[PDB]
Amino acid sequence: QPFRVTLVEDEPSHATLIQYHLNQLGAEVTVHPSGSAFFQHRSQLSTCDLLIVSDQLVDLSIFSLLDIVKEQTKQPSVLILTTGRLIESSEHNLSYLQKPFAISELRAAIDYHKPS
């Protein structure tokens, strides 16, 4: 099976860097350059295995974003790229990675959310 990853990130240089490593770890990646891009494709999260989202999209809060994910009938694992330092959820699928991060951490993270 494929490892479908959706990347929602609005700094294009962090997005392209993350996308490069996703492709080296063997992901089929969908990149949404904004929160509005993500919203208009809400529906395709039922086929996503891992959602990597920034904590600080200029046009959608992580809270709204996470509540939109919660409306879907199949929810992915979520990896939240953060600065500050942890959102209280009772779905158990939020993991976090703090920027600035080492590339090794990014890749361990992504690999620990692969199948099977």
Side-chain angles (χ1 to χ4, degrees), residues 46-73 75-81:
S46 298
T47 60
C48 173
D49 296 293
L50 163 68
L51 178 59
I52 309 173
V53 292
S54 179
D55 217 30
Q56 49 198 116
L57 301 164
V58 294
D59 70 321
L60 199 62
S61 69
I62 194 56
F63 304 102
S64 294
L65 193 154
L66 289 190
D67 270 295
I68 290 171
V69 169
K70 262 217 220 53
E71 289 165 20
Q72 311 314 306
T73 56
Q75 302 174 50
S77 288
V78 183
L79 177 62
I80 300 177
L81 311 168

PDB file of all heavy atoms in Angstrom, residues 46-81, unseen atoms left out:
ATOM      1  N   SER A  46      -9.692  11.258   4.340  1.00  0.00           N
ATOM      2  CA  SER A  46     -10.123   9.900   4.570  1.00  0.00           C
ATOM      3  C   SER A  46      -9.189   8.891   3.924  1.00  0.00           C
ATOM      4  O   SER A  46      -9.239   7.698   4.240  1.00  0.00           O
ATOM      5  CB  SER A  46     -11.544   9.753   4.062  1.00  0.00           C
ATOM      6  OG  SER A  46     -12.370  10.641   4.823  1.00  0.00           O
ATOM      7  N   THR A  47      -8.335   9.375   3.028  1.00  0.00           N
ATOM      8  CA  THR A  47      -7.317   8.552   2.348  1.00  0.00           C
ATOM      9  C   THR A  47      -5.880   8.909   2.763  1.00  0.00           C
ATOM     10  O   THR A  47      -4.930   8.296   2.289  1.00  0.00           O
ATOM     11  CB  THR A  47      -7.386   8.790   0.844  1.00  0.00           C
ATOM     12  OG1 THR A  47      -7.135  10.187   0.593  1.00  0.00           O
ATOM     13  CG2 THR A  47      -8.760   8.385   0.287  1.00  0.00           C
ATOM     14  N   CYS A  48      -5.732   9.917   3.620  1.00  0.00           N
ATOM     15  CA  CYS A  48      -4.442  10.355   4.114  1.00  0.00           C
ATOM     16  C   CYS A  48      -3.995   9.467   5.279  1.00  0.00           C
ATOM     17  O   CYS A  48      -4.788   9.137   6.148  1.00  0.00           O
ATOM     18  CB  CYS A  48      -4.571  11.800   4.554  1.00  0.00           C
ATOM     19  SG  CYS A  48      -3.163  12.455   5.369  1.00  0.00           S
ATOM     20  N   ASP A  49      -2.729   9.056   5.276  1.00  0.00           N
ATOM     21  CA  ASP A  49      -2.149   8.298   6.392  1.00  0.00           C
ATOM     22  C   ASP A  49      -1.536   9.222   7.488  1.00  0.00           C
ATOM     23  O   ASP A  49      -1.663   8.955   8.666  1.00  0.00           O
ATOM     24  CB  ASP A  49      -1.086   7.318   5.866  1.00  0.00           C
ATOM     25  CG  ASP A  49      -1.681   6.217   4.927  1.00  0.00           C
ATOM     26  OD1 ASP A  49      -2.456   5.355   5.407  1.00  0.00           O
ATOM     27  OD2 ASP A  49      -1.363   6.208   3.710  1.00  0.00           O
ATOM     28  N   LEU A  50      -0.887  10.315   7.093  1.00  0.00           N
ATOM     29  CA  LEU A  50      -0.258  11.239   8.029  1.00  0.00           C
ATOM     30  C   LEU A  50      -0.459  12.676   7.552  1.00  0.00           C
ATOM     31  O   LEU A  50      -0.175  13.008   6.403  1.00  0.00           O
ATOM     32  CB  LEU A  50       1.234  10.916   8.144  1.00  0.00           C
ATOM     33  CG  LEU A  50       2.140  11.985   8.757  1.00  0.00           C
ATOM     34  CD1 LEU A  50       1.800  12.112  10.200  1.00  0.00           C
ATOM     35  CD2 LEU A  50       3.637  11.699   8.545  1.00  0.00           C
ATOM     36  N   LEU A  51      -0.932  13.538   8.434  1.00  0.00           N
ATOM     37  CA  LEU A  51      -1.087  14.952   8.117  1.00  0.00           C
ATOM     38  C   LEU A  51      -0.026  15.701   8.902  1.00  0.00           C
ATOM     39  O   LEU A  51       0.043  15.592  10.131  1.00  0.00           O
ATOM     40  CB  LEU A  51      -2.480  15.401   8.503  1.00  0.00           C
ATOM     41  CG  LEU A  51      -2.908  16.846   8.319  1.00  0.00           C
ATOM     42  CD1 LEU A  51      -2.814  17.301   6.832  1.00  0.00           C
ATOM     43  CD2 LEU A  51      -4.369  16.988   8.891  1.00  0.00           C
ATOM     44  N   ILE A  52       0.857  16.402   8.188  1.00  0.00           N
ATOM     45  CA  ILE A  52       1.868  17.274   8.800  1.00  0.00           C
ATOM     46  C   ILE A  52       1.377  18.687   8.565  1.00  0.00           C
ATOM     47  O   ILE A  52       1.243  19.103   7.417  1.00  0.00           O
ATOM     48  CB  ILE A  52       3.246  17.126   8.123  1.00  0.00           C
ATOM     49  CG1 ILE A  52       3.653  15.646   8.035  1.00  0.00           C
ATOM     50  CG2 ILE A  52       4.296  17.996   8.848  1.00  0.00           C
ATOM     51  CD1 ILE A  52       4.886  15.396   7.251  1.00  0.00           C
ATOM     52  N   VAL A  53       1.172  19.432   9.644  1.00  0.00           N
ATOM     53  CA  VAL A  53       0.547  20.734   9.576  1.00  0.00           C
ATOM     54  C   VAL A  53       1.373  21.698  10.370  1.00  0.00           C
ATOM     55  O   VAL A  53       1.887  21.336  11.404  1.00  0.00           O
ATOM     56  CB  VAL A  53      -0.926  20.707  10.175  1.00  0.00           C
ATOM     57  CG1 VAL A  53      -1.840  19.891   9.290  1.00  0.00           C
ATOM     58  CG2 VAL A  53      -0.974  20.105  11.561  1.00  0.00           C
ATOM     59  N   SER A  54       1.490  22.929   9.908  1.00  0.00           N
ATOM     60  CA  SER A  54       2.071  23.959  10.719  1.00  0.00           C
ATOM     61  C   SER A  54       1.073  24.545  11.730  1.00  0.00           C
ATOM     62  O   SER A  54      -0.077  24.782  11.417  1.00  0.00           O
ATOM     63  CB  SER A  54       2.574  25.090   9.846  1.00  0.00           C
ATOM     64  OG  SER A  54       3.123  26.133  10.653  1.00  0.00           O
ATOM     65  N   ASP A  55       1.600  24.825  12.918  1.00  0.00           N
ATOM     66  CA  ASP A  55       0.960  25.429  14.090  1.00  0.00           C
ATOM     67  C   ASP A  55       0.555  26.851  13.797  1.00  0.00           C
ATOM     68  O   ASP A  55      -0.078  27.518  14.617  1.00  0.00           O
ATOM     69  CB  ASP A  55       2.112  25.563  15.119  1.00  0.00           C
ATOM     70  CG  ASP A  55       1.720  25.307  16.551  1.00  0.00           C
ATOM     71  OD1 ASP A  55       0.796  24.511  16.812  1.00  0.00           O
ATOM     72  OD2 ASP A  55       2.423  25.873  17.432  1.00  0.00           O
ATOM     73  N   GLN A  56       1.066  27.410  12.716  1.00  0.00           N
ATOM     74  CA  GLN A  56       0.909  28.836  12.545  1.00  0.00           C
ATOM     75  C   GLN A  56       0.679  29.292  11.126  1.00  0.00           C
ATOM     76  O   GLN A  56       1.233  30.265  10.665  1.00  0.00           O
ATOM     77  CB  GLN A  56       2.048  29.597  13.235  1.00  0.00           C
ATOM     78  CG  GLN A  56       3.457  29.151  12.963  1.00  0.00           C
ATOM     79  CD  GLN A  56       4.430  29.693  14.039  1.00  0.00           C
ATOM     80  OE1 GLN A  56       5.029  28.912  14.796  1.00  0.00           O
ATOM     81  NE2 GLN A  56       4.562  31.026  14.123  1.00  0.00           N
ATOM     82  N   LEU A  57      -0.249  28.625  10.471  1.00  0.00           N
ATOM     83  CA  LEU A  57      -0.723  29.078   9.178  1.00  0.00           C
ATOM     84  C   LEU A  57      -1.364  30.447   9.393  1.00  0.00           C
ATOM     85  O   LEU A  57      -2.075  30.656  10.396  1.00  0.00           O
ATOM     86  CB  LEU A  57      -1.758  28.102   8.616  1.00  0.00           C
ATOM     87  CG  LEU A  57      -1.236  26.695   8.429  1.00  0.00           C
ATOM     88  CD1 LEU A  57      -2.440  25.775   8.270  1.00  0.00           C
ATOM     89  CD2 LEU A  57      -0.235  26.668   7.252  1.00  0.00           C
ATOM     90  N   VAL A  58      -1.110  31.360   8.458  1.00  0.00           N
ATOM     91  CA  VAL A  58      -1.588  32.740   8.555  1.00  0.00           C
ATOM     92  C   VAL A  58      -3.094  32.894   8.406  1.00  0.00           C
ATOM     93  O   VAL A  58      -3.654  33.921   8.809  1.00  0.00           O
ATOM     94  CB  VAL A  58      -0.919  33.665   7.482  1.00  0.00           C
ATOM     95  CG1 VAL A  58       0.574  33.808   7.752  1.00  0.00           C
ATOM     96  CG2 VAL A  58      -1.168  33.132   6.063  1.00  0.00           C
ATOM     97  N   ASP A  59      -3.725  31.887   7.807  1.00  0.00           N
ATOM     98  CA  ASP A  59      -5.143  31.912   7.428  1.00  0.00           C
ATOM     99  C   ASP A  59      -5.987  30.793   8.078  1.00  0.00           C
ATOM    100  O   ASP A  59      -7.178  30.669   7.772  1.00  0.00           O
ATOM    101  CB  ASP A  59      -5.241  31.779   5.901  1.00  0.00           C
ATOM    102  CG  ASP A  59      -4.841  30.376   5.407  1.00  0.00           C
ATOM    103  OD1 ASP A  59      -3.872  29.774   5.940  1.00  0.00           O
ATOM    104  OD2 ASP A  59      -5.506  29.870   4.477  1.00  0.00           O
ATOM    105  N   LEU A  60      -5.397  29.962   8.940  1.00  0.00           N
ATOM    106  CA  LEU A  60      -6.199  29.026   9.734  1.00  0.00           C
ATOM    107  C   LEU A  60      -5.498  28.651  11.036  1.00  0.00           C
ATOM    108  O   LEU A  60      -4.329  28.303  11.034  1.00  0.00           O
ATOM    109  CB  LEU A  60      -6.457  27.768   8.918  1.00  0.00           C
ATOM    110  CG  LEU A  60      -7.597  26.865   9.336  1.00  0.00           C
ATOM    111  CD1 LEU A  60      -8.921  27.601   9.249  1.00  0.00           C
ATOM    112  CD2 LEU A  60      -7.578  25.622   8.437  1.00  0.00           C
ATOM    113  N   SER A  61      -6.212  28.688  12.150  1.00  0.00           N
ATOM    114  CA  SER A  61      -5.600  28.298  13.406  1.00  0.00           C
ATOM    115  C   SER A  61      -5.523  26.774  13.497  1.00  0.00           C
ATOM    116  O   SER A  61      -6.372  26.037  12.955  1.00  0.00           O
ATOM    117  CB  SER A  61      -6.369  28.872  14.593  1.00  0.00           C
ATOM    118  OG  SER A  61      -7.650  28.263  14.741  1.00  0.00           O
ATOM    119  N   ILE A  62      -4.513  26.306  14.215  1.00  0.00           N
ATOM    120  CA  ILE A  62      -4.350  24.896  14.444  1.00  0.00           C
ATOM    121  C   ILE A  62      -5.606  24.336  15.101  1.00  0.00           C
ATOM    122  O   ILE A  62      -5.983  23.211  14.823  1.00  0.00           O
ATOM    123  CB  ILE A  62      -3.085  24.623  15.306  1.00  0.00           C
ATOM    124  CG1 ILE A  62      -2.704  23.141  15.275  1.00  0.00           C
ATOM    125  CG2 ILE A  62      -3.247  25.167  16.737  1.00  0.00           C
ATOM    126  CD1 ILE A  62      -2.474  22.535  13.835  1.00  0.00           C
ATOM    127  N   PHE A  63      -6.307  25.116  15.920  1.00  0.00           N
ATOM    128  CA  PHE A  63      -7.523  24.603  16.558  1.00  0.00           C
ATOM    129  C   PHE A  63      -8.652  24.302  15.569  1.00  0.00           C
ATOM    130  O   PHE A  63      -9.284  23.255  15.627  1.00  0.00           O
ATOM    131  CB  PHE A  63      -7.981  25.614  17.566  1.00  0.00           C
ATOM    132  CG  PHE A  63      -6.934  25.933  18.548  1.00  0.00           C
ATOM    133  CD1 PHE A  63      -6.203  27.106  18.448  1.00  0.00           C
ATOM    134  CD2 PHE A  63      -6.638  25.029  19.565  1.00  0.00           C
ATOM    135  CE1 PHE A  63      -5.231  27.400  19.367  1.00  0.00           C
ATOM    136  CE2 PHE A  63      -5.672  25.302  20.482  1.00  0.00           C
ATOM    137  CZ  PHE A  63      -4.960  26.491  20.394  1.00  0.00           C
ATOM    138  N   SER A  64      -8.892  25.251  14.676  1.00  0.00           N
ATOM    139  CA  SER A  64      -9.884  25.129  13.597  1.00  0.00           C
ATOM    140  C   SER A  64      -9.502  24.000  12.689  1.00  0.00           C
ATOM    141  O   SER A  64     -10.325  23.217  12.296  1.00  0.00           O
ATOM    142  CB  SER A  64      -9.899  26.413  12.767  1.00  0.00           C
ATOM    143  OG  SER A  64     -10.380  27.478  13.568  1.00  0.00           O
ATOM    144  N   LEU A  65      -8.235  23.961  12.322  1.00  0.00           N
ATOM    145  CA  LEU A  65      -7.728  22.904  11.498  1.00  0.00           C
ATOM    146  C   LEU A  65      -7.989  21.531  12.148  1.00  0.00           C
ATOM    147  O   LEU A  65      -8.578  20.618  11.555  1.00  0.00           O
ATOM    148  CB  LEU A  65      -6.246  23.172  11.283  1.00  0.00           C
ATOM    149  CG  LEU A  65      -5.549  22.378  10.194  1.00  0.00           C
ATOM    150  CD1 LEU A  65      -4.349  23.199   9.722  1.00  0.00           C
ATOM    151  CD2 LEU A  65      -5.149  21.011  10.719  1.00  0.00           C
ATOM    152  N   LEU A  66      -7.615  21.389  13.404  1.00  0.00           N
ATOM    153  CA  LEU A  66      -7.810  20.116  14.076  1.00  0.00           C
ATOM    154  C   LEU A  66      -9.283  19.785  14.233  1.00  0.00           C
ATOM    155  O   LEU A  66      -9.656  18.623  14.325  1.00  0.00           O
ATOM    156  CB  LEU A  66      -7.114  20.112  15.432  1.00  0.00           C
ATOM    157  CG  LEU A  66      -5.570  20.069  15.462  1.00  0.00           C
ATOM    158  CD1 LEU A  66      -5.089  19.808  16.912  1.00  0.00           C
ATOM    159  CD2 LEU A  66      -5.010  19.047  14.549  1.00  0.00           C
ATOM    160  N   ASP A  67     -10.145  20.780  14.292  1.00  0.00           N
ATOM    161  CA  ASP A  67     -11.611  20.506  14.448  1.00  0.00           C
ATOM    162  C   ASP A  67     -12.237  20.106  13.132  1.00  0.00           C
ATOM    163  O   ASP A  67     -13.255  19.450  13.124  1.00  0.00           O
ATOM    164  CB  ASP A  67     -12.352  21.728  14.976  1.00  0.00           C
ATOM    165  CG  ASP A  67     -12.424  21.757  16.502  1.00  0.00           C
ATOM    166  OD1 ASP A  67     -13.075  20.856  17.108  1.00  0.00           O
ATOM    167  OD2 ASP A  67     -11.836  22.689  17.093  1.00  0.00           O
ATOM    168  N   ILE A  68     -11.633  20.564  12.034  1.00  0.00           N
ATOM    169  CA  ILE A  68     -12.023  20.176  10.692  1.00  0.00           C
ATOM    170  C   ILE A  68     -11.598  18.756  10.455  1.00  0.00           C
ATOM    171  O   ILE A  68     -12.341  18.002   9.840  1.00  0.00           O
ATOM    172  CB  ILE A  68     -11.400  21.085   9.606  1.00  0.00           C
ATOM    173  CG1 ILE A  68     -12.029  22.463   9.680  1.00  0.00           C
ATOM    174  CG2 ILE A  68     -11.636  20.555   8.176  1.00  0.00           C
ATOM    175  CD1 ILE A  68     -11.310  23.432   8.801  1.00  0.00           C
ATOM    176  N   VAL A  69     -10.419  18.367  10.932  1.00  0.00           N
ATOM    177  CA  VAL A  69      -9.974  16.968  10.807  1.00  0.00           C
ATOM    178  C   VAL A  69     -10.899  16.016  11.552  1.00  0.00           C
ATOM    179  O   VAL A  69     -11.203  14.916  11.060  1.00  0.00           O
ATOM    180  CB  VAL A  69      -8.536  16.791  11.302  1.00  0.00           C
ATOM    181  CG1 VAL A  69      -8.191  15.314  11.412  1.00  0.00           C
ATOM    182  CG2 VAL A  69      -7.562  17.521  10.354  1.00  0.00           C
ATOM    183  N   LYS A  70     -11.366  16.459  12.725  1.00  0.00           N
ATOM    184  CA  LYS A  70     -12.263  15.708  13.569  1.00  0.00           C
ATOM    185  C   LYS A  70     -13.637  15.465  12.988  1.00  0.00           C
ATOM    186  O   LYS A  70     -14.356  14.611  13.511  1.00  0.00           O
ATOM    187  CB  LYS A  70     -12.508  16.444  14.881  1.00  0.00           C
ATOM    188  CG  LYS A  70     -11.678  15.987  16.050  1.00  0.00           C
ATOM    189  CD  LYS A  70     -12.484  16.025  17.360  1.00  0.00           C
ATOM    190  CE  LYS A  70     -11.636  16.547  18.538  1.00  0.00           C
ATOM    191  NZ  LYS A  70     -10.986  17.884  18.242  1.00  0.00           N
ATOM    192  N   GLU A  71     -14.041  16.255  11.994  1.00  0.00           N
ATOM    193  CA  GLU A  71     -15.335  16.073  11.299  1.00  0.00           C
ATOM    194  C   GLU A  71     -15.231  14.883  10.337  1.00  0.00           C
ATOM    195  O   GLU A  71     -16.235  14.333   9.950  1.00  0.00           O
ATOM    196  CB  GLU A  71     -15.715  17.291  10.431  1.00  0.00           C
ATOM    197  CG  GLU A  71     -16.138  18.613  11.108  1.00  0.00           C
ATOM    198  CD  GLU A  71     -16.146  19.879  10.120  1.00  0.00           C
ATOM    199  OE1 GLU A  71     -16.195  19.754   8.848  1.00  0.00           O
ATOM    200  OE2 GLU A  71     -16.104  21.021  10.643  1.00  0.00           O
ATOM    201  N   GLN A  72     -14.031  14.509   9.902  1.00  0.00           N
ATOM    202  CA  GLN A  72     -13.897  13.416   8.923  1.00  0.00           C
ATOM    203  C   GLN A  72     -14.164  12.031   9.568  1.00  0.00           C
ATOM    204  O   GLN A  72     -13.985  11.840  10.788  1.00  0.00           O
ATOM    205  CB  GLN A  72     -12.535  13.479   8.199  1.00  0.00           C
ATOM    206  CG  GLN A  72     -12.133  14.889   7.612  1.00  0.00           C
ATOM    207  CD  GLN A  72     -13.257  15.578   6.853  1.00  0.00           C
ATOM    208  OE1 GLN A  72     -13.835  15.006   5.920  1.00  0.00           O
ATOM    209  NE2 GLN A  72     -13.575  16.819   7.248  1.00  0.00           N
ATOM    210  N   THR A  73     -14.617  11.071   8.756  1.00  0.00           N
ATOM    211  CA  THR A  73     -14.945   9.736   9.277  1.00  0.00           C
ATOM    212  C   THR A  73     -13.722   8.808   9.383  1.00  0.00           C
ATOM    213  O   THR A  73     -13.732   7.898  10.204  1.00  0.00           O
ATOM    214  CB  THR A  73     -16.069   9.060   8.474  1.00  0.00           C
ATOM    215  OG1 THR A  73     -15.679   9.016   7.103  1.00  0.00           O
ATOM    216  CG2 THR A  73     -17.375   9.848   8.625  1.00  0.00           C
ATOM    217  N   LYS A  74     -12.684   9.022   8.581  1.00  0.00           N
ATOM    218  CA  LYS A  74     -11.382   8.391   8.870  1.00  0.00           C
ATOM    219  C   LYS A  74     -10.385   9.515   9.142  1.00  0.00           C
ATOM    220  O   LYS A  74     -10.179  10.396   8.312  1.00  0.00           O
ATOM    221  CB  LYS A  74     -10.927   7.436   7.730  1.00  0.00           C
ATOM    222  CG  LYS A  74      -9.594   6.590   7.965  1.00  0.00           C
ATOM    223  CD  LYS A  74      -9.607   5.229   7.198  1.00  0.00           C
ATOM    224  N   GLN A  75      -9.779   9.504  10.319  1.00  0.00           N
ATOM    225  CA  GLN A  75      -8.793  10.520  10.632  1.00  0.00           C
ATOM    226  C   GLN A  75      -7.366   9.998  10.575  1.00  0.00           C
ATOM    227  O   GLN A  75      -7.069   8.926  11.097  1.00  0.00           O
ATOM    228  CB  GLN A  75      -9.052  11.071  11.989  1.00  0.00           C
ATOM    229  CG  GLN A  75     -10.435  11.656  12.081  1.00  0.00           C
ATOM    230  CD  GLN A  75     -10.739  12.075  13.462  1.00  0.00           C
ATOM    231  OE1 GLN A  75      -9.934  12.777  14.076  1.00  0.00           O
ATOM    232  NE2 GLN A  75     -11.891  11.655  13.986  1.00  0.00           N
ATOM    233  N   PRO A  76      -6.466  10.782   9.977  1.00  0.00           N
ATOM    234  CA  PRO A  76      -5.063  10.423   9.932  1.00  0.00           C
ATOM    235  C   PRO A  76      -4.348  10.609  11.270  1.00  0.00           C
ATOM    236  O   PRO A  76      -4.876  11.272  12.147  1.00  0.00           O
ATOM    237  CB  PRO A  76      -4.480  11.429   8.937  1.00  0.00           C
ATOM    238  CG  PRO A  76      -5.392  12.612   8.990  1.00  0.00           C
ATOM    239  CD  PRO A  76      -6.742  12.094   9.355  1.00  0.00           C
ATOM    240  N   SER A  77      -3.144  10.049  11.410  1.00  0.00           N
ATOM    241  CA  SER A  77      -2.165  10.566  12.385  1.00  0.00           C
ATOM    242  C   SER A  77      -1.844  12.006  12.023  1.00  0.00           C
ATOM    243  O   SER A  77      -1.855  12.337  10.843  1.00  0.00           O
ATOM    244  CB  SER A  77      -0.905   9.722  12.344  1.00  0.00           C
ATOM    245  OG  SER A  77      -1.229   8.469  12.939  1.00  0.00           O
ATOM    246  N   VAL A  78      -1.622  12.857  13.027  1.00  0.00           N
ATOM    247  CA  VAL A  78      -1.296  14.242  12.783  1.00  0.00           C
ATOM    248  C   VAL A  78       0.042  14.567  13.432  1.00  0.00           C
ATOM    249  O   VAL A  78       0.278  14.167  14.551  1.00  0.00           O
ATOM    250  CB  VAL A  78      -2.351  15.215  13.352  1.00  0.00           C
ATOM    251  CG1 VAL A  78      -1.969  16.619  12.984  1.00  0.00           C
ATOM    252  CG2 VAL A  78      -3.753  14.903  12.814  1.00  0.00           C
ATOM    253  N   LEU A  79       0.905  15.295  12.710  1.00  0.00           N
ATOM    254  CA  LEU A  79       2.204  15.724  13.201  1.00  0.00           C
ATOM    255  C   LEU A  79       2.185  17.231  13.075  1.00  0.00           C
ATOM    256  O   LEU A  79       1.956  17.763  11.985  1.00  0.00           O
ATOM    257  CB  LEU A  79       3.329  15.109  12.361  1.00  0.00           C
ATOM    258  CG  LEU A  79       4.770  15.500  12.690  1.00  0.00           C
ATOM    259  CD1 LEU A  79       5.131  15.063  14.103  1.00  0.00           C
ATOM    260  CD2 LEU A  79       5.732  14.911  11.644  1.00  0.00           C
ATOM    261  N   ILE A  80       2.354  17.919  14.192  1.00  0.00           N
ATOM    262  CA  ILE A  80       2.196  19.361  14.220  1.00  0.00           C
ATOM    263  C   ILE A  80       3.555  19.947  14.383  1.00  0.00           C
ATOM    264  O   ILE A  80       4.260  19.606  15.363  1.00  0.00           O
ATOM    265  CB  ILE A  80       1.369  19.822  15.423  1.00  0.00           C
ATOM    266  CG1 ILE A  80      -0.028  19.190  15.369  1.00  0.00           C
ATOM    267  CG2 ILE A  80       1.275  21.368  15.428  1.00  0.00           C
ATOM    268  CD1 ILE A  80      -0.925  19.521  16.570  1.00  0.00           C
ATOM    269  N   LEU A  81       3.919  20.844  13.456  1.00  0.00           N
ATOM    270  CA  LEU A  81       5.211  21.506  13.474  1.00  0.00           C
ATOM    271  C   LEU A  81       5.010  22.759  14.280  1.00  0.00           C
ATOM    272  O   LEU A  81       4.256  23.608  13.881  1.00  0.00           O
ATOM    273  CB  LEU A  81       5.692  21.826  12.041  1.00  0.00           C
ATOM    274  CG  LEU A  81       5.607  20.642  11.047  1.00  0.00           C
ATOM    275  CD1 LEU A  81       5.815  21.076   9.571  1.00  0.00           C
ATOM    276  CD2 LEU A  81       6.564  19.558  11.442  1.00  0.00           C
TER     277      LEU A  81
END
